Write a protein that binds this ligand. Structure first.
Ligand SMILES: *C(#N)N1[C]C2=C([C]1)C([N]C1=[C][C]=[C][C]=C1C(F)(F)F)=[C][C]=[C]2
Length: 207
């Protein structure tokens, strides 16, 4: 009844990735993954500790968690892989058993204040009775492409993790019709070393 992974019984993440394809992939294809989730109870982290890193007026982590449901709420810590005029992409995929029309907002936040939001819709495809929600190869919003290139040219990774300590993403998934929450995901970030590639730990947010 406790989650084993990033999802409810109602809506679950199949896959998420932010990536870059260099322009020479048109000949000899090759992708770089900044972060990547591909899909034993998860460890929990108290949500009140993480209020700092997200805004607190509306669509902030307090008021959504007050609004619930609590089991839809997750924290992901990413270790971003930051070594690599190509294409910059985000691909996300969810799965259900209801036929819903999803709305996915992504709040990019800085010192816990919203800087960019992207709000997409996806209706389901029926595949194996299981219903499938594909938001694939979405262009990365230019704030975060430019953030990456600024970030990557820092001379020390403690400077990078100093920056990313004040950098968060809140991703909010709702049924478009019923206006009810399905899955809300806070993201906190570090830079992994060069030898490491991308990695993640997934938590429940409890209160
Ligand atoms: C813009 N458009 N977006 C929407 C959106 C983005 C960027 C992310 N970005 C993300 C997630 C994890 C690690 C790195 C990044 C990025 F793109 F480099 F900032 C996630 C969700 C939605």
């Amino acid at each position: 009844w406790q989650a084993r992974g990033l999802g409810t019984a109602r809506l679950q993440l199949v896959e998420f990735s932010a990536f870059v394809e260099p322009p020479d992939a048109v000949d000899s294809y090759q992708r770089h993954l900044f972060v990547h989730i591909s899909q034993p109870p998860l460890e929990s982290v108290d949500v009140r500790q993480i209020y700092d890193k997200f805004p607190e007026k509306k669509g902030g982590l307090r008021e959504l968690y007050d609004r619930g449901p609590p089991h839809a709420f997750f924290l992901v810590k990413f270790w971003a892989d930051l070594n690599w005029g190509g294409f910059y992409g985000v691909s996300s995929q969810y799965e259900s058993l209801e036929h819903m029309t999803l709305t996915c907002s992504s709040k990019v936040c800085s010192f816990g204040k919203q800087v960019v939001e992207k709000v997409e819709t996806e209706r389901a495809q029926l595949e194996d009775g299981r219903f499938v929600y594909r938001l694939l190869r979405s262009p990365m919003c230019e704030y975060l492409v430019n953030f990456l290139h600024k970030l990557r040219q820092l001379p020390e990774r403690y400077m990078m993790n100093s920056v990313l300590e004040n950098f968060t993403i809140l991703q909010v998934v709702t049924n478009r019709d019923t206006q009810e929450l399905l899955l809300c995901t806070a993201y906190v970030f570090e830079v992994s070393t060069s030898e490491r590639g991308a990695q993640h730990h997934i938590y429940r947010l409890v209160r």
